[PDB]
DNA sequence: GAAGATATCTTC
DNA sequence: GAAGATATCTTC
């Protein structure tokens, strides 16, 4: 399908290329950081040529916000289906030791899932799929070599500020999790995992539905969701008792 | 002077490399998108090299943060002059125009500035100075080639999703501003002007001390702010009553 | 101007 | 866990 195109084509590309700098016109190399302000940003632009690659093989239309601080990085739709919008998102997170679990944040509760046309590119109904790619990457501590700018026949010289990179591409719905992912800036938050469990999809909500009700009346504080609910078996109770 | 020389610098290789994307070691290239979570990244990364080169030259030990979210960019510092350390952040925004009046966020105003030790690389009495090496760049729209990879001897193709970009450095105190740049996750707001003004110094504060003062004890919310300063006026007048 | 959005992590 | 930090922007 796409969806399986777009997984294969990510793996793929992940596989044979590692990230190594910022390419000026003119030749010259600038090395990165091993922080995830960077790294992030890295991945999300590593992204963008293979889902659009992909998605055009596919005769769907990319776009992307033309606003900045607008969900989704890509918005996916066949010209025939305006109303079947695939949202893909991505997110990056780290590991401090390679294979130890991983928690993402999910992008607002208090945004677009509260407000149809708030923070998107196409009103909220117009979108069927919410998809995530998500990233992990190894911390590297920087050396020296890294405050050094570069040649382009010096690429395998340059170091790289990660190790261990791998994607995934996963519903939103089937991973999110049951606890902010932020506090001030109020985000979903994903399930407490390893990766496998991303891929293979080990969320905790029995539908699409149940996440986005969950998270369109989660509290912000503590101290309101304590009277409310503040975790998956809480908002069902609280469901059966009427909602409330 | 090391700054003099940290500026020039950056005026040179800012006027002789356009960055227009991201490398692999593979020699791959994936271009830049638009927005200033991107550039931000990018001229932050352009930055690092070159301040470590003067800073090099000029005897300076550069450290950058281990930690993630940890102030600041850069933490310069003479080995004999272990209290008389500098800091170094670089900074971002964009202009719908190409001249047009710009702002900057500062960094926290309940971090490091109320907690000498608060998300910093060292203590914030150790830092006798604090610079902001800031970017500004014409937001500039396009796709007509963005979502492809290019190679190596194709750098000339790729579309730079930016016009006009321009740097200054500055004492952060000499342009910082009076309101604040940033709401729930609380910045210290630049003053609101051109670029000339920001290279200028055309600040507001008498001094670092009236700049930390001003910030340390502004109120997170206008409510709270109404009832005790919210400019510099509105300050002055506040200390001159007593601090009361 | 004030508050809260964009994304992700560390501190409390 | 919660809350608040990292940086910058848009919305209200």
Same mark, same amino acid.
């Given at each position: 399908s796409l969806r399986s195109d777009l997984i294969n084509a990510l793996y793929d590309e992940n596989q044979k290329y590692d990230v190594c700098g910022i390419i000026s016109a003119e030749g010259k190399i600038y090395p990165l950081g091993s922080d995830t302000k960077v790294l992030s940003t890295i991945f999300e632009l590593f992204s963008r040529p293979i889902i659009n690659k992909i998605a055009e093989k596919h005769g769907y239309i990319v776009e992307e916000p033309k $606003? $900045?601080?607008?969900? =989704?990085?890509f918005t996916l739709y066949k010209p025939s289906e305006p109303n079947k919008k695939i949202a893909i998102d991505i997110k990056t997170t780290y590991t401090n030791k390679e294979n130890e679990k991983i928690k993402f *944040?999910?992008? &607002?509760? @208090? /945004?677009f899932i509260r407000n149809? @046309?708030?923070?998107?590119?196409? =009103?909220?109904? $117009?979108?069927?799929a919410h998809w995530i790619i998500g990233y992990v990457y190894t911390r590297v501590a920087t050396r020296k070599s890294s405050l050094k700018t570069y040649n382009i026949n010096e690429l395998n010289e340059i170091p790289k500020p990660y190790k261990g990179v791998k994607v995934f591409l996963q519903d939103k719905w089937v991973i999110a &999790?049951?606890?902010? &992912? /932020?506090?001030? *800036? *109020?985000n979903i938050g994903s399930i407490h995992a390893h990766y496998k469990d991303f891929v293979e999809g080990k969320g905790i909500f029995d539908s699409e539905d149940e996440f986005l009700d969950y998270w369109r009346n989660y509290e912000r504080t503590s101290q309101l969701r304590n009277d409310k609910y503040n975790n998956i078996s809480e908002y069902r109770n609280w469901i059966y008792r009427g909602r409330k």
């Open positions: $606003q $900045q601080n607008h969900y =989704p990085d *944040t999910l992008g &607002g509760y @208090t /945004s149809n @046309t708030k923070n998107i590119v196409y =009103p909220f109904d $117009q979108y069927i &999790g049951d606890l902010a &992912g /932020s506090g001030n *800036t *109020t």
